[PDB]
């Protein structure tokens, strides 16, 4: 499926710390973030994505149109300017964030009832799994 719609509840989160250190997330935010359960809400209509990630203390919202490059400010993450582009590779949703950090981006894909997220920055890879709620 290429349909990522739904409310997704975190089930596994491997090496979030190394990914966040690659981004120069400060020690403080890192320790809080590594313990929190995240809910990821995706409202997808054609190419148009409205996405949310909510926790009891840290939140991240981004909207994008597949295939349309956009300048992004990674507000309350590492607060950097990147040139973002989200495209399809088969049924994998792939984002490249061009900027100062190397190999920065993410990939989303679904297997069965699970959403998989791979976050990359530098030589670090974080893998998260969500169960559809």
Ligand X SMILES: *C/C=C/c1ccc2c(c1)C(C)(C)c1cc(N(CC)CC)ccc1-2
Q: Is 109 a residue that touches ligand X (CB under 6 A)?
A: no
3-state secondary structure at position 44: strand
Nearer to ligand X, 29 or 87 (CB): 29
Residues paired with 62 in a beta bridge? 51
CA distances from 91 to 26, 98, 111 (A): 34, 22, 10
Q: Is 125 a residue that touches ligand X (CB under 6 A)?
A: no
Q: Is 94 a residue that touches ligand X (CB under 6 A)?
A: no
Interface of this chain with ligand X, residues 72 to 91, rule: CB under 6 A = 77
Residue 60 Cβ vs ligand X, minimum distance, rounded to whole Å? 4
Q: Is 8 a residue that touches ligand X (CB under 6 A)?
A: no
7, 29, 87, 124: which one binds ligand X (CB under 6 A): 29
Residue 112 Cβ vs ligand X, minimum distance, rounded to whole Å? 18
Q: Is 58 a residue that touches ligand X (CB under 6 A)?
A: yes
Cβ–Cβ contacts within 10 Å for residue 107, how many? 17
Residues 6+ apart with CB under 8 A from 65: 47, 48, 49, 86
Nearest CA among 71, 51, 72 for reference residue 63: 51
Reading across the β-sheet that carries 48-54, which strands appear in turn?
60-65, 48-54, 39-45, 6-14, 124-132, 114-121, 105-111, 92-98, 81-89, 70-73
Nearer to ligand X, 57 or 113 (CB): 57
Q: Is 33 a residue that touches ligand X (CB under 6 A)?
A: yes
Residues of this chain that interact with ligand X (CB under 6 A) are 20, 25, 29, 33, 38, 53, 58, 60, 77, 106, 108, 117, 119
């Amino acid at each position: 499926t290429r349909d990522f719609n739904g409310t997704w509840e975190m089930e596994s989160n491997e090496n979030f710390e190394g990914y966040m250190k690659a981004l120069d997330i400060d020690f403080a935010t890192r320790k809080i973030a590594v313990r929190l359960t995240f809910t990821h809400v995706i409202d997808q209509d054609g190419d148009n994505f409205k996405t949310k990630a909510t926790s009891t203390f840290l939140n991240y919202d981004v909207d994008f149109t597949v295939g349309v490059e956009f300048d992004e400010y990674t507000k309350s993450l590492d607060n950097r300017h990147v040139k973002a582009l989200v495209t399809w590779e088969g049924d994998v949703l792939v984002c490249v964030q061009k900027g100062e950090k190397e190999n920065r981006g993410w990939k989303k894909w679904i297997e069965g009832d699970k959403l998989y997220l791979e976050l990359t920055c530098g030589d670090q890879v974080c893998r998260q799994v969500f169960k559809k709620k």
